[PDB]
RNA sequence: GGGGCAACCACACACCGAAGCUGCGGGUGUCACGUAAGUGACGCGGUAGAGGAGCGUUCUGUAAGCCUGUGAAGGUG
RNA sequence: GGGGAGUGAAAUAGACCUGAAACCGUAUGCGUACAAGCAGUGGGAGCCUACUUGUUAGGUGACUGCGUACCUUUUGUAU
């Protein structure tokens, strides 16, 4: 029972094509290059879940940090200041409250302040 | 109106009206759901921030449906030592619907 | 719009690249001067067939041959004849010769 | 001397950029309404209006 | 999600800055922070959002110790031996803006954000700038 | 490391900081449970290499069946 | 060599069933002429065409953070 190889062959380099396009020149078309620029994609877009998480930290804090100088504090005598009371709040919300309802983080503030820290 | 309710280990802007999609919760579709964990209610200007969760407040939710967004691939290869291994995920969620804000 | 075609022509494609973005989107009244004129070999064959599109239109399809603009030009590759040519100590390497499809489309609009 | 990397379908277009036609000498014969190159004899044979041959 | 500034809603401003005595790099660590815009608390790092200045007195700064007559400022021009350098003391009776030009364009990102931040520095040698139809404020003198 | 002046010793609080730990949601090996998964009950980087469990291709049985000119195999979305 | 017209169930079955990939073109959309590198990935402005008209989807990707291909030999290779 010969067996030819000619047609699944052929449906699985369809499948590596599909995730390729898109590319610069070479690497879109042909499929020794396009096999090594789905790896190295795929590499990427596995370090790039952790560093997602850590590229909007470090934006939160540097928003709270311009916002709380304007009223009167730094950061992290801030930071010492909820924590000394109990307010409980995340960095993602106190960021929106930085930029949209700018009253309502100005009534956080004086209660820090009120901490004493 | 806009509380901060805490649904899944992390806390969210609700203003009501409200399509939101939250982890997976152990109830069916279309019962009401109450959050006793809300952390600030403003309203208009009258804001007030909670001593760690606010006396009294509620919000009412009911669930609109459940499904499972995404195909997210995973590639754990090494160069030069024979080793390549994936998977594949999708994650659950619920998608919710806030009638809710209760100063 | 009419067309004609030039099937098997013998000089090559990127030679006669250059007469076709000459004339594409001109009317054919100063179409057949350009052509005229030219000291090129592909630009005998041209003239060729742009009168072979225009004279499908005085005839089959009605057309008067002042509103016709040569719209859509291109020049294809075709079959390539291969050769060898003998080189130096011994060794002897191949030639091929090429050809071309040729496509003058006018329309009356 | 040989390459030693392959040129993309980029840098073999960009090369033949500079390589196009002109034909600007165009000229009408005055008498007979005949099309030929400006400084030329006409293929009838006039120049500027007059039988040359 | 989170908000991002968008650059045809940007809002900014124009300050003066007086040079009179400053020192060279404690000035000029105000202005860059400032030419960034970590002041504003809508600040995305991707578009640009800060504020014009300009700054007037670039003779008067003022450098400490014995740094006046060292710190030689080398460049290079890029045929063989082509090194050159000048100290502090005399290049500020030569130009004396670029003293403080190129003491905050090092303190800036070196991207074309960072090329785009460093046109609105705005530096004179004299004591009055041609913007008085933008109507400066002062700050921090 | 550069601009530049944020240098050294004693000392105090605060913050920052990993795929570490915690929270929430899924999955799986093992052993018990609460019937060894009805359910529990505790772990998971990996080369050489040892062990476990699967997909697809061609031909034969089931196949004088079943599907198809209202449209097969293929090719392409 | 074509453009018709006629035969045929069908001439993009025309001297030849199907007719793929590399390679070469022609149209239509969006981005690129002060900006430095395994050419992707995370965030992301704008524009376009569709749908109820915008998360209803698709296509481009200015700007910006991290990022020195694959195999084989080896105590180690972006090498």
Redo the contacts between chains.
């Keep these: 029972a010969r067996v030819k190889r000619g047609v699944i062959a052929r449906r699985r380099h369809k499948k590596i094509l599909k995730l390729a396009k898109g590319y610069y020149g070479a690497r879109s078309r042909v499929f020794r290059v396009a096999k090594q620029a789905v790896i190295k994609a795929g590499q990427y877009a596995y370090r790039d879940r952790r560093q997602r998480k850590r590229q909007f930290r470090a934006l939160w804090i540097a928003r709270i940090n311009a916002g709380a100088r304007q009223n009167g504090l730094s950061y992290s005598r801030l930071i010492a200041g909820l924590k000394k009371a109990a307010i409980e709040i995340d960095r993602k919300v106190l960021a929106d409250l930085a930029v949209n309802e700018k009253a309502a983080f100005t009534a956080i503030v004086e209660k820090a302040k009120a901490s004493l820290a | 109106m806009y509380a901060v309710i805490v649904t899944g280990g992390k806390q969210h802007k609700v203003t009501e009206g409200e399509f939101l999609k939250v982890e997976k919760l152990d109830v069916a579709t279309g019962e009401a759901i109450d959050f006793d964990r809300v952390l600030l209610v403003a309203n208009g200007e009258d804001v007030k921030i909670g001593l760690p969760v606010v006396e009294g407040a509620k919000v009412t939710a009911e669930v609109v449906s459940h499904g499972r967004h995404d195909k997210v691939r995973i590639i754990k290869f090494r160069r030069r030592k024979h080793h390549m291994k994936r998977q594949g995920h999708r994650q659950w969620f619920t998608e919710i619907k806030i009638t809710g804000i209760q100063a | 719009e009419v067309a004609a075609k030039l099937s098997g022509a013998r000089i090559s494609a990127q030679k006669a690249r250059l007469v076709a973005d000459q004339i594409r989107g001109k009317k054919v009244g100063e179409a057949l001067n350009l052509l005229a004129f030219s000291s090129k070999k592909a630009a005998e064959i041209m003239k060729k067939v742009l009168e072979s599109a225009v004279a499908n239109a005085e005839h089959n399809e009605g057309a008067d041959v002042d509103d016709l603009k040569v719209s859509t030009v291109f020049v294809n590759e075709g079959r390539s004849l291969k050769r060898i040519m003998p080189r130096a100590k011994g060794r002897a390497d191949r030639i091929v010769k090429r050809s071309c499809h040729i496509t003058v489309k006018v329309a009356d609009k | 001397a040989v390459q030693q990397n392959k040129k993309?379908?980029?840098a073999r277009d960009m090369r033949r950029s500079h390589?196009?036609?002109e034909?600007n000498?165009?000229s009408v014969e005055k008498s007979t309404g005949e099309?030929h190159?400006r400084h030329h004899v006409s293929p009838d044979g006039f120049y500027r209006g007059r039988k040359v041959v | 999600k989170t908000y991002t500034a968008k650059p045809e809603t940007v809002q900014r401003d124009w300050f003066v800055v007086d040079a009179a005595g400053q020192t060279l790099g404690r000035l000029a660590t105000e202005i860059a922070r400032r030419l960034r815009g970590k002041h504003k608390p809508e600040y995305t790092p991707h578009v640009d959002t800060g504020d014009y200045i300009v700054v007037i007195n670039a003779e008067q700064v003022r450098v400490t110790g014995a740094k006046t007559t060292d710190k030689m400022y080398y460049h290079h021009s890029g045929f063989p031996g082509g090194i050159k350098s000048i100290n502090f003391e005399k290049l500020i009776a030569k130009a004396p803006e670029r003293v403080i030009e190129t003491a905050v364009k090092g303190m800036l990102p070196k991207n074309p954000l960072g090329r785009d931040m460093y046109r609105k520095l705005k530096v004179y040698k004299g004591a009055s700038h041609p913007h008085t139809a933008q109507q400066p404020q002062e700050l921090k003198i």
């Design positions: 993309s379908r980029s390589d196009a036609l034909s000498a165009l099309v190159l």
